[PDB]
Design an enzyme around this catalytic site. Structure first.
Site, mmCIF file in Angstrom:
data_model
loop_
_atom_site.group_PDB
_atom_site.id
_atom_site.type_symbol
_atom_site.label_atom_id
_atom_site.label_comp_id
_atom_site.label_asym_id
_atom_site.label_seq_id
_atom_site.Cartn_x
_atom_site.Cartn_y
_atom_site.Cartn_z
ATOM 1 N N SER A 46 8.355 25.557 -32.007
ATOM 2 C CA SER A 46 9.808 25.668 -31.978
ATOM 3 C C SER A 46 10.315 26.973 -32.538
ATOM 4 C CB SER A 46 10.455 24.524 -32.760
ATOM 5 O OG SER A 46 10.401 23.313 -32.027
ATOM 6 N N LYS A 49 12.855 29.167 -30.790
ATOM 7 C CA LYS A 49 14.271 28.823 -30.727
ATOM 8 C C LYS A 49 15.134 29.814 -31.492
ATOM 9 C CE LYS A 49 13.043 24.024 -29.977
ATOM 10 N NZ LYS A 49 12.458 22.820 -30.655
ATOM 11 N N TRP A 81 13.114 14.278 -30.192
ATOM 12 C CA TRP A 81 13.644 15.164 -31.230
ATOM 13 C C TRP A 81 14.782 16.039 -30.695
ATOM 14 C CZ3 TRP A 81 13.986 14.397 -35.977
ATOM 15 C CH2 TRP A 81 14.500 15.392 -36.814
ATOM 16 N N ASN A 108 15.620 19.845 -29.402
ATOM 17 C CA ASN A 108 14.860 20.162 -28.196
ATOM 18 C C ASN A 108 15.735 20.133 -26.950
ATOM 19 O OD1 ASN A 108 12.208 20.803 -29.011
ATOM 20 N ND2 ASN A 108 11.848 18.667 -29.557
ATOM 21 N N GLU A 144 6.405 20.665 -23.363
ATOM 22 C CA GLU A 144 5.089 21.126 -22.902
ATOM 23 C C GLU A 144 4.632 22.400 -23.601
ATOM 24 O OE1 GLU A 144 7.413 20.090 -20.687
ATOM 25 O OE2 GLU A 144 6.430 18.182 -20.164
ATOM 26 N N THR A 211 11.457 27.606 -38.311
ATOM 27 C CA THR A 211 10.153 26.962 -38.332
ATOM 28 C C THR A 211 9.654 26.650 -36.915
ATOM 29 O OG1 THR A 211 11.131 24.747 -38.559
ATOM 30 C CG2 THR A 211 10.697 25.948 -40.595
#
Ligand SMILES: O=C(c1cccc(C(F)(F)F)c1)N1C[C@@H](c2nnn[nH]2)c2ccccc21
Length: 268
Positions: A46, A49, A81, A108, A144, A211
């Site tokens: 992630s 992002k 999430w 997400n 994915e 993170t």
């Protein structure tokens, strides 16, 4: 000589973690850098992002009013999430709220909705190319992109490239002045990183971070811009992975590597 100073501490930490740790840290008011596997590729998870939100901000400098655009979405846009976007399913959110959700909660559904606005993973990769980052690649969508398969270069970057791009975006000229501080503010408001880089910095330091946690292959990470009180900012990235799919990530390993990096830079 800083890199050599930390070579053996890092190696033993990664030996007890049971995987690989990649660290790049940069002292911006000194030029000093610390590097350990800084050019190896690690899954972004992630952590892409953060750059996603920066790409949105960049686009807002051309597409006036982009940040206040309402985005409506259906139940089918929801993805495991999506803690923020779940709560506005019945109302929609603005592009700025999706961006803050992606950065500060790793939402997400928000990430995928913004990726779609940007032209998908290739659009985000293109934005990173446009600021001088030749390493970053995003190839897939949530969830994915989290597969973190050993040796797979999809959805990876290097700790060094992450730090250099983060410095350009938060401290340099890659974003216009209001967009840059907006990016910084979103990073400062992050809620998911209290046990990683933030755990390694003194309580009086300002911190913005993003993170990433893939959930497999002991793969997790954090990158941050850090302001010592009255001193020049430090930018740093800590990325981990491990050989086995069931290997667990360690937040403490990430905090330990951050502290090692800052001590190596001589500013802890
Ligand atoms: O499933 C999770 C999650 C939620 C609560 C607690 C935990 C725990 F296991 F830590 F207790 C994990 N999350 C958290 C979030 C994230 N963002 N950066 N790291 N993790 C993220 C991004 C992408 C996919 C899933 C997820």
């Amino acid at each position: 000589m800083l890199t050599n100073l930390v070579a053996e501490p890092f190696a033993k930490l990664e030996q007890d973690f049971g995987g690989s740790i990649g660290v790049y840290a940069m002292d911006t008011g000194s030029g000093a850098t610390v590097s350990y596997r800084a050019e190896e590729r690690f899954p972004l998870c992630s952590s892409f992002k953060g750059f996603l939100a920066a790409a949105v901000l960049a686009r807002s400098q051309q597409q006036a009013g982009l940040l206040d655009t309402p985005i409506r979405y259906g139940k089918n846009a929801l993805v495991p999430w999506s803690p923020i976007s779940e709560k506005y399913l019945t109302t929609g959110m603005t592009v700025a709220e999706l961006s803050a959700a992606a950065v500060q909660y790793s939402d997400n559904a928000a990430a995928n909705l913004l990726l779609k606005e940007l032209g998908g993973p290739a659009g985000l990769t293109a934005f990173m190319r446009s600021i001088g980052d030749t390493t970053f690649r995003l190839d897939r969508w949530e969830l994915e992109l989290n597969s973190a398969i050993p040796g797979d270069a999809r959805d990876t970057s290097s700790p060094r490239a992450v730090t250099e791009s983060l410095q350009k975006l938060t401290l340099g000229s890659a974003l216009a002045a209001p967009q840059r501080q907006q990016f910084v503010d979103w990073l400062k408001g992050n809620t998911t990183g209290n046990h990683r880089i933030r755990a390694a910095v003194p309580a009086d330091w300002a911190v913005g971070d993003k993170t990433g946690t893939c959930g497999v292959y002991g793969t997790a990470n954090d990158y941050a811009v850090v302001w010592p009180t009255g001193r020049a900012p430090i930018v740093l990235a800590v990325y981990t992975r491990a050989p086995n799919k069931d290997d667990k990530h360690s937040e403490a390993v990430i905090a330990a590597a951050a502290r090692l990096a800052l001590e190596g830079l001589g500013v802890n």
